[PDB]
Amino acid sequence: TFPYENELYYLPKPLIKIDSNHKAFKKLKYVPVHHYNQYLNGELSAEDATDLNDIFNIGYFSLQTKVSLIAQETDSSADSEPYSVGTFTFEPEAGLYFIAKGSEETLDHLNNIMTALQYSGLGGKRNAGYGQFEYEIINNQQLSKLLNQNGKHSILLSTAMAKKEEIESALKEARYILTKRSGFVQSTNYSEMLVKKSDFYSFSSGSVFKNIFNGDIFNVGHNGKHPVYRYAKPLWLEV
Protein backbone atom coordinates (compact mmCIF):
# COMPACT_ATOMS: atom_id res chain seq x y z
CA THR A 1 0.00 0.00 0.00
CA PHE A 2 1.17 3.51 -0.72
CA PRO A 3 -0.53 6.70 0.45
CA TYR A 4 -1.99 9.53 -1.57
CA GLU A 5 -3.23 13.07 -0.99
CA ASN A 6 -5.64 15.21 -3.08
CA GLU A 7 -4.07 14.67 -6.51
CA LEU A 8 -0.58 13.49 -5.54
CA TYR A 9 0.47 9.85 -5.51
CA TYR A 10 3.39 8.53 -3.53
CA LEU A 11 5.97 5.78 -3.76
CA PRO A 12 8.67 4.77 -1.26
CA LYS A 13 12.20 6.07 -1.21
CA PRO A 14 14.66 3.95 -3.18
CA LEU A 15 17.55 2.96 -0.96
CA ILE A 16 19.97 4.15 -3.63
CA LYS A 17 23.50 5.35 -2.93
CA ILE A 18 23.53 9.11 -3.47
CA ASP A 19 26.92 10.84 -3.21
CA SER A 20 26.85 14.37 -1.86
CA ASN A 21 23.88 16.72 4.82
CA HIS A 22 22.91 13.04 5.05
CA LYS A 23 20.20 14.40 7.38
CA ALA A 24 17.35 15.82 5.30
CA PHE A 25 17.11 12.66 3.21
CA LYS A 26 17.10 10.48 6.32
CA LYS A 27 13.96 12.10 7.74
CA LEU A 28 12.21 11.47 4.41
CA LYS A 29 10.21 8.34 3.67
CA TYR A 30 8.15 8.91 0.52
CA VAL A 31 8.66 10.79 -2.75
CA PRO A 32 5.65 11.69 -4.93
CA VAL A 33 5.33 10.57 -8.53
CA HIS A 34 6.10 14.03 -9.97
CA HIS A 35 9.67 14.17 -8.65
CA TYR A 36 10.54 10.47 -8.56
CA ASN A 37 12.78 10.37 -11.63
CA GLN A 38 14.33 13.58 -10.34
CA TYR A 39 15.21 11.76 -7.12
CA LEU A 40 16.63 8.82 -9.02
CA ASN A 41 18.87 11.21 -10.99
CA GLY A 42 19.94 13.63 -8.28
CA GLU A 43 17.66 16.47 -9.36
CA LEU A 44 16.37 16.89 -5.78
CA SER A 45 17.87 19.59 -3.58
CA ALA A 46 17.95 19.95 0.18
CA GLU A 47 15.48 22.84 0.17
CA ASP A 48 13.28 20.74 -2.10
CA ALA A 49 13.55 17.90 0.41
CA THR A 50 12.43 20.25 3.17
CA ASP A 51 9.51 21.44 1.04
CA LEU A 52 8.38 17.94 0.09
CA ASN A 53 8.53 16.90 3.73
CA ASP A 54 6.55 20.01 4.62
CA ILE A 55 3.75 19.12 2.19
CA PHE A 56 3.49 15.52 3.45
CA ASN A 57 0.59 16.04 5.88
CA ILE A 58 -1.55 13.07 4.85
CA GLY A 59 -2.99 11.89 8.16
CA TYR A 60 -2.56 12.01 11.91
CA PHE A 61 -2.20 9.46 14.70
CA SER A 62 -4.23 8.91 17.84
CA LEU A 63 -4.77 6.64 20.83
CA GLN A 64 -8.41 6.03 21.82
CA THR A 65 -9.01 4.74 25.36
CA LYS A 66 -11.42 1.91 26.10
CA VAL A 67 -12.58 -0.14 29.08
CA SER A 68 -13.60 -3.79 29.40
CA LEU A 69 -16.43 -4.51 31.83
CA ILE A 70 -16.98 -8.18 30.98
CA ALA A 71 -14.98 -8.96 34.12
CA GLN A 72 -16.22 -9.45 37.69
CA GLU A 73 -17.63 -5.92 37.51
CA THR A 74 -20.52 -8.03 36.27
CA ASP A 75 -20.18 -10.11 39.45
CA SER A 76 -18.81 -8.07 42.36
CA SER A 77 -16.40 -5.29 43.32
CA ALA A 78 -13.67 -5.62 40.70
CA ASP A 79 -11.67 -2.99 38.88
CA SER A 80 -12.21 -2.18 35.25
CA GLU A 81 -9.36 -3.06 32.90
CA PRO A 82 -8.75 -0.13 30.56
CA TYR A 83 -6.97 -0.92 27.31
CA SER A 84 -5.76 1.21 24.42
CA VAL A 85 -6.00 1.06 20.64
CA GLY A 86 -3.94 2.85 18.02
CA THR A 87 -5.68 4.48 15.10
CA PHE A 88 -4.96 6.57 12.04
CA THR A 89 -7.32 9.02 10.37
CA PHE A 90 -6.99 10.45 6.87
CA GLU A 91 -7.93 13.95 5.78
CA PRO A 92 -10.91 14.12 3.42
CA GLU A 93 -8.71 13.59 0.34
CA ALA A 94 -6.21 10.95 1.46
CA GLY A 95 -6.08 7.16 1.41
CA LEU A 96 -4.01 4.27 0.11
CA TYR A 97 -3.54 2.76 -3.34
CA PHE A 98 -2.52 -0.61 -4.84
CA ILE A 99 -0.76 -1.69 -7.99
CA ALA A 100 -1.74 -5.10 -9.34
CA LYS A 101 -0.87 -6.97 -12.49
CA GLY A 102 -1.73 -10.25 -14.15
CA SER A 103 -3.98 -11.64 -16.81
CA GLU A 104 -7.25 -9.89 -17.56
CA GLU A 105 -9.22 -12.75 -16.02
CA THR A 106 -7.21 -12.53 -12.82
CA LEU A 107 -7.96 -8.82 -12.63
CA ASP A 108 -11.68 -9.40 -13.16
CA HIS A 109 -11.65 -11.86 -10.26
CA LEU A 110 -9.69 -9.35 -8.20
CA ASN A 111 -12.39 -6.77 -8.91
CA ASN A 112 -15.09 -9.14 -7.69
CA ILE A 113 -13.21 -9.96 -4.51
CA MET A 114 -12.46 -6.29 -3.85
CA THR A 115 -16.15 -5.50 -4.14
CA ALA A 116 -16.72 -8.21 -1.55
CA LEU A 117 -13.98 -6.77 0.66
CA GLN A 118 -15.01 -3.11 0.70
CA TYR A 119 -17.71 -3.93 3.27
CA SER A 120 -15.41 -6.09 5.34
CA GLY A 121 -12.35 -4.37 6.78
CA LEU A 122 -8.66 -4.23 6.03
CA GLY A 123 -7.17 -3.74 9.46
CA GLY A 124 -7.22 -4.79 13.07
CA LYS A 125 -10.28 -4.23 15.22
CA ARG A 126 -12.59 -4.46 12.22
CA ASN A 127 -15.55 -5.81 14.16
CA ALA A 128 -15.32 -3.01 16.74
CA GLY A 129 -15.85 -0.24 14.20
CA TYR A 130 -12.57 0.40 12.39
CA GLY A 131 -11.57 0.14 8.79
CA GLN A 132 -14.22 0.13 6.09
CA PHE A 133 -13.58 1.62 2.68
CA GLU A 134 -14.85 2.51 -0.77
CA TYR A 135 -12.59 1.98 -3.76
CA GLU A 136 -12.21 3.47 -7.22
CA ILE A 137 -10.15 2.30 -10.19
CA ILE A 138 -8.39 5.17 -11.96
CA ASN A 139 -5.73 5.06 -14.68
CA ASN A 140 -3.02 7.65 -14.04
CA GLN A 141 -0.82 8.28 -17.06
CA GLN A 142 2.27 9.25 -15.09
CA LEU A 143 2.31 6.22 -12.79
CA SER A 144 1.90 4.00 -15.85
CA LYS A 145 4.88 5.68 -17.50
CA LEU A 146 6.96 5.17 -14.36
CA LEU A 147 5.99 1.51 -14.16
CA ASN A 148 6.76 0.83 -17.84
CA GLN A 149 10.37 1.99 -18.13
CA ASN A 150 13.47 -0.12 -18.79
CA GLY A 151 16.72 0.16 -16.87
CA LYS A 152 19.59 -1.62 -15.11
CA HIS A 153 18.69 -1.35 -11.43
CA SER A 154 15.44 -2.44 -9.81
CA ILE A 155 13.40 -0.94 -6.97
CA LEU A 156 11.48 -3.52 -4.97
CA LEU A 157 8.02 -2.10 -4.32
CA SER A 158 6.64 -4.98 -2.27
CA THR A 159 7.94 -7.38 0.37
CA ALA A 160 9.68 -10.38 -1.17
CA MET A 161 12.00 -13.23 -0.31
CA ALA A 162 13.85 -15.19 -2.97
CA LYS A 163 13.46 -18.93 -3.08
CA LYS A 164 16.22 -21.16 -1.77
CA GLU A 165 17.96 -21.73 -5.08
CA GLU A 166 18.19 -18.13 -6.31
CA ILE A 167 19.25 -16.10 -3.28
CA GLU A 168 22.99 -16.57 -3.80
CA SER A 169 22.92 -14.85 -7.18
CA ALA A 170 20.14 -12.50 -6.10
CA LEU A 171 22.19 -10.73 -3.41
CA LYS A 172 25.22 -9.87 -5.57
CA GLU A 173 24.97 -6.07 -5.28
CA ALA A 174 22.07 -4.83 -3.20
CA ARG A 175 20.93 -2.35 -0.56
CA TYR A 176 18.17 -3.69 1.64
CA ILE A 177 16.43 -3.81 5.00
CA LEU A 178 14.97 -6.97 6.52
CA THR A 179 11.87 -6.98 8.72
CA LYS A 180 10.72 -9.70 11.10
CA ARG A 181 7.08 -10.14 10.03
CA SER A 182 4.99 -12.05 12.60
CA GLY A 183 1.38 -12.53 13.72
CA PHE A 184 -1.28 -15.06 14.70
CA VAL A 185 -3.70 -16.96 12.45
CA GLN A 186 -7.48 -17.07 12.05
CA SER A 187 -9.26 -20.45 12.49
CA THR A 188 -6.43 -22.99 12.32
CA ASN A 189 -6.51 -24.90 15.62
CA TYR A 190 -8.31 -24.84 18.96
CA SER A 191 -6.43 -22.10 20.81
CA GLU A 192 -5.70 -18.82 19.06
CA MET A 193 -3.13 -18.03 21.75
CA LEU A 194 -1.42 -21.41 21.09
CA VAL A 195 -1.28 -20.77 17.32
CA LYS A 196 1.20 -18.20 16.00
CA LYS A 197 2.91 -18.13 12.64
CA SER A 198 6.60 -18.88 12.59
CA ASP A 199 8.49 -15.64 12.18
CA PHE A 200 9.38 -14.72 8.62
CA TYR A 201 11.95 -12.28 7.30
CA SER A 202 11.59 -10.55 3.95
CA PHE A 203 13.18 -7.62 2.18
CA SER A 204 11.47 -4.28 2.73
CA SER A 205 9.58 -2.17 0.20
CA GLY A 206 12.46 0.00 -0.99
CA SER A 207 15.37 -2.33 -1.62
CA VAL A 208 17.46 -2.12 -4.80
CA PHE A 209 18.78 -5.12 -6.71
CA LYS A 210 20.86 -5.98 -9.80
CA ASN A 211 19.53 -9.45 -10.60
CA ILE A 212 15.79 -10.03 -10.50
CA PHE A 213 14.33 -12.93 -8.54
CA ASN A 214 10.85 -14.34 -8.66
CA GLY A 215 9.27 -15.06 -5.32
CA ASP A 216 6.92 -17.66 -3.88
CA ILE A 217 4.00 -17.94 -1.48
CA PHE A 218 5.75 -19.46 1.51
CA ASN A 219 4.08 -21.53 4.17
CA VAL A 220 4.56 -20.40 7.74
CA GLY A 221 2.52 -23.41 8.72
CA HIS A 222 2.96 -26.11 11.34
CA ASN A 223 0.71 -27.85 13.87
CA GLY A 224 -2.37 -26.88 11.86
CA LYS A 225 -5.34 -28.28 9.97
CA HIS A 226 -4.82 -26.21 6.81
CA PRO A 227 -1.84 -24.49 5.21
CA VAL A 228 -1.30 -20.85 6.12
CA TYR A 229 0.22 -18.69 3.42
CA ARG A 230 2.57 -15.73 3.52
CA TYR A 231 3.20 -13.62 0.44
CA ALA A 232 6.60 -12.91 -1.06
CA LYS A 233 6.53 -11.90 -4.71
CA PRO A 234 8.11 -8.68 -5.97
CA LEU A 235 6.63 -5.92 -8.05
CA TRP A 236 9.65 -4.41 -9.76
CA LEU A 237 10.11 -0.83 -10.88
CA GLU A 238 12.80 -0.77 -13.54
CA VAL A 239 14.90 2.38 -13.47
Binding site: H22, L63, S84
Partner: protein
Protein backbone atom coordinates in the same frame (compact mmCIF):
# COMPACT_ATOMS: atom_id res chain seq x y z
CA UNK B 1 3.26 12.58 33.05
CA UNK B 2 5.77 14.64 31.11
CA UNK B 3 8.25 13.43 28.49
CA UNK B 4 10.95 15.54 26.81
CA UNK B 5 13.08 14.82 23.74
CA UNK B 6 15.86 17.11 22.51
CA UNK B 7 18.32 17.10 19.61
CA UNK B 8 21.22 19.42 18.93
CA UNK B 9 20.28 21.15 15.69
CA UNK B 10 23.83 21.95 14.54
CA UNK B 11 25.60 18.71 15.47
CA UNK B 12 26.14 16.96 12.15
CA UNK B 13 27.99 20.02 10.89
CA UNK B 14 29.81 20.52 14.20
CA UNK B 15 31.10 16.95 14.26
CA UNK B 16 31.89 17.14 10.54
CA UNK B 17 32.43 20.71 9.34
CA UNK B 18 33.80 21.92 12.67
CA UNK B 19 35.97 25.02 12.79
CA UNK B 20 36.97 25.85 9.22
CA UNK B 21 40.38 25.63 7.66
CA UNK B 22 42.58 26.16 10.70
CA UNK B 23 41.58 24.06 13.72
CA UNK B 24 40.69 20.79 11.96
CA UNK B 25 43.15 18.33 13.46
CA UNK B 26 42.38 15.07 15.17
CA UNK B 27 43.24 16.76 18.47
CA UNK B 28 40.78 19.62 18.26
CA UNK B 29 37.78 17.63 17.06
CA UNK B 30 38.64 15.10 19.75
CA UNK B 31 38.53 17.74 22.46
CA UNK B 32 35.24 19.07 21.12
CA UNK B 33 33.81 15.55 21.25
CA UNK B 34 34.98 15.06 24.82
CA UNK B 35 33.45 18.38 25.83
CA UNK B 36 30.01 17.56 24.44
CA UNK B 37 30.13 14.07 25.93
CA UNK B 38 31.10 15.22 29.41
CA UNK B 39 28.42 17.89 29.23
CA UNK B 40 25.67 15.39 28.55
CA UNK B 41 27.06 12.85 31.05
CA UNK B 42 27.79 15.03 34.09
CA UNK B 43 25.99 18.34 33.67
CA UNK B 44 22.57 16.73 33.31
CA UNK B 45 23.05 14.90 36.60
CA UNK B 46 23.79 18.15 38.41
CA UNK B 47 21.22 20.31 36.63
CA UNK B 48 18.35 17.90 37.29
CA UNK B 49 18.78 17.85 41.08
CA UNK B 50 15.94 20.16 42.15
CA UNK B 51 13.48 18.38 39.86
CA UNK B 52 11.19 15.38 40.30
CA UNK B 53 12.61 13.65 37.24
CA UNK B 54 14.33 10.34 36.56
CA UNK B 55 16.92 10.20 33.78
CA UNK B 56 16.21 7.58 31.14
CA UNK B 57 18.52 7.86 28.14
CA UNK B 58 20.90 10.79 27.79
CA UNK B 59 24.09 11.23 25.81
CA UNK B 60 25.32 12.06 22.33
CA UNK B 61 22.64 14.53 21.30
CA UNK B 62 19.53 12.76 22.64
CA UNK B 63 17.77 14.00 25.78
CA UNK B 64 15.02 11.71 27.10
CA UNK B 65 13.60 12.67 30.49
CA UNK B 66 10.24 11.73 32.00
CA UNK B 67 8.45 13.01 35.08
CA UNK B 68 5.70 15.27 36.36
CA UNK B 69 4.03 17.67 33.92
CA UNK B 70 4.97 20.99 35.55
CA UNK B 71 8.41 19.77 36.52
CA UNK B 72 9.27 18.65 32.99
CA UNK B 73 8.49 22.11 31.63
CA UNK B 74 10.50 23.89 34.31
CA UNK B 75 13.48 21.57 33.94
CA UNK B 76 13.37 21.84 30.15
CA UNK B 77 13.59 25.62 30.36
CA UNK B 78 16.41 25.40 32.90
CA UNK B 79 18.35 22.93 30.75
CA UNK B 80 17.95 25.00 27.58
CA UNK B 81 19.29 28.09 29.31
CA UNK B 82 22.15 26.24 31.00
CA UNK B 83 23.11 24.70 27.67
CA UNK B 84 23.12 28.04 25.89
CA UNK B 85 25.51 29.11 28.65
CA UNK B 86 27.94 26.24 28.05
CA UNK B 87 27.87 26.48 24.25
CA UNK B 88 28.27 30.27 24.45
CA UNK B 89 25.07 30.64 22.40
CA UNK B 90 26.57 28.88 19.37
CA UNK B 91 24.49 25.68 19.28
CA UNK B 92 20.70 25.45 19.52
CA UNK B 93 18.36 22.78 20.86
CA UNK B 94 14.96 21.71 19.59
CA UNK B 95 12.74 19.95 22.10
CA UNK B 96 9.21 18.66 22.48
CA UNK B 97 7.20 18.09 25.66
CA UNK B 98 3.81 16.40 25.75
CA UNK B 99 1.28 15.48 28.41
CA UNK B 100 0.79 11.73 28.69
CA UNK B 101 -1.53 9.97 31.11
CA UNK B 102 -0.21 7.51 33.65
CA UNK B 103 -0.10 3.78 32.93
CA UNK B 104 0.15 4.18 29.16
CA UNK B 105 2.56 1.73 27.53
CA UNK B 106 5.72 3.80 27.50
CA UNK B 107 6.67 2.32 24.14
CA UNK B 108 3.75 4.32 22.71
CA UNK B 109 4.37 7.68 24.48
CA UNK B 110 7.96 7.75 23.16
CA UNK B 111 6.87 7.49 19.53
CA UNK B 112 4.58 10.49 20.02
CA UNK B 113 7.32 12.84 21.19
CA UNK B 114 12.77 29.19 23.54
CA UNK B 115 13.36 32.78 24.58
CA UNK B 116 9.85 33.41 23.25
CA UNK B 117 8.24 30.82 25.52
CA UNK B 118 10.21 31.86 28.60
CA UNK B 119 9.91 35.64 28.40
CA UNK B 120 6.52 36.11 26.79
CA UNK B 121 4.39 33.15 27.91
CA UNK B 122 5.77 31.85 31.20
CA UNK B 123 7.14 35.04 32.71
CA UNK B 124 4.52 37.70 31.91
CA UNK B 125 1.14 36.25 31.02
CA UNK B 126 1.33 33.21 33.29
CA UNK B 127 2.41 35.30 36.27
CA UNK B 128 -0.30 37.93 35.90
CA UNK B 129 -2.89 35.19 35.38
CA UNK B 130 -1.77 33.24 38.45
CA UNK B 131 -1.86 36.40 40.55
CA UNK B 132 -5.31 37.21 39.20
CA UNK B 133 -6.80 33.87 40.16
CA UNK B 134 -4.93 33.86 43.48
CA UNK B 135 -6.43 37.22 44.45
CA UNK B 136 -10.01 36.39 43.40
CA UNK B 137 -11.54 33.09 44.51
CA UNK B 138 -14.53 31.21 43.05
CA UNK B 139 -12.82 31.22 39.64
CA UNK B 140 -12.78 27.45 39.40
CA UNK B 141 -12.24 25.32 36.33
CA UNK B 142 -15.75 26.35 35.25
CA UNK B 143 -14.90 30.04 34.75
CA UNK B 144 -11.59 29.21 33.08
CA UNK B 145 -13.26 26.69 30.81
CA UNK B 146 -15.91 29.19 29.74
CA UNK B 147 -13.02 31.48 28.91
CA UNK B 148 -11.64 28.67 26.74
CA UNK B 149 -15.03 28.09 25.14
CA UNK B 150 -15.16 31.72 24.08
CA UNK B 151 -11.52 31.92 23.02
CA UNK B 152 -11.10 28.82 20.85
CA UNK B 153 -13.97 29.95 18.63
CA UNK B 154 -12.25 32.98 17.09
CA UNK B 155 -15.26 35.22 16.47
CA UNK B 156 -16.08 38.83 17.32
CA UNK B 157 -19.46 38.00 18.85
CA UNK B 158 -17.44 35.73 21.10
CA UNK B 159 -15.26 38.73 21.93
CA UNK B 160 -18.34 40.60 23.10
CA UNK B 161 -19.43 37.56 25.10
CA UNK B 162 -16.00 37.31 26.72
CA UNK B 163 -16.26 40.99 27.57
CA UNK B 164 -19.55 40.27 29.32
CA UNK B 165 -18.04 37.35 31.22
CA UNK B 166 -15.02 39.34 32.39
CA UNK B 167 -17.39 42.13 33.40
CA UNK B 168 -19.35 39.68 35.53
CA UNK B 169 -16.17 38.48 37.19
CA UNK B 170 -14.73 40.39 40.15
CA UNK B 171 -11.11 40.78 39.08
CA UNK B 172 -9.26 44.06 39.44
CA UNK B 173 -9.63 46.49 36.55
CA UNK B 174 -5.99 45.97 35.59
CA UNK B 175 -6.35 42.20 35.23
CA UNK B 176 -9.57 42.37 33.22
CA UNK B 177 -8.21 45.15 31.01
CA UNK B 178 -5.00 43.25 30.26
CA UNK B 179 -6.92 40.07 29.49
CA UNK B 180 -9.25 41.89 27.11
CA UNK B 181 -6.46 43.74 25.32
CA UNK B 182 -4.60 40.45 24.86
CA UNK B 183 -7.80 38.81 23.66
CA UNK B 184 -8.09 41.33 20.85
CA UNK B 185 -4.82 40.14 19.21
CA UNK B 186 -4.19 36.81 17.49
CA UNK B 187 -0.63 36.14 18.66
CA UNK B 188 -1.44 37.34 22.16
CA UNK B 189 -4.60 35.27 22.34
CA UNK B 190 -2.86 32.07 21.30
CA UNK B 191 -0.21 32.76 23.92
CA UNK B 192 -2.96 33.48 26.45
CA UNK B 193 -4.65 30.19 25.63
CA UNK B 194 -1.39 28.33 26.17
CA UNK B 195 -0.69 30.15 29.43
CA UNK B 196 -4.08 29.56 31.00
CA UNK B 197 -4.04 25.95 29.85
CA UNK B 198 -0.79 25.69 31.77
CA UNK B 199 -2.54 27.22 34.77
CA UNK B 200 -4.83 24.20 34.99
Amino acid sequence: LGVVRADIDNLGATFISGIPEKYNSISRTATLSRQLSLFFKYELNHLLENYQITAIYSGGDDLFLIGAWDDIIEASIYINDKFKEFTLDKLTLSAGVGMFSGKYPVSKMAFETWDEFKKNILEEKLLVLQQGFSQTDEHGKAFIYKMLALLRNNEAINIARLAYLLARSKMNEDFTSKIFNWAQNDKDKNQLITALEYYI
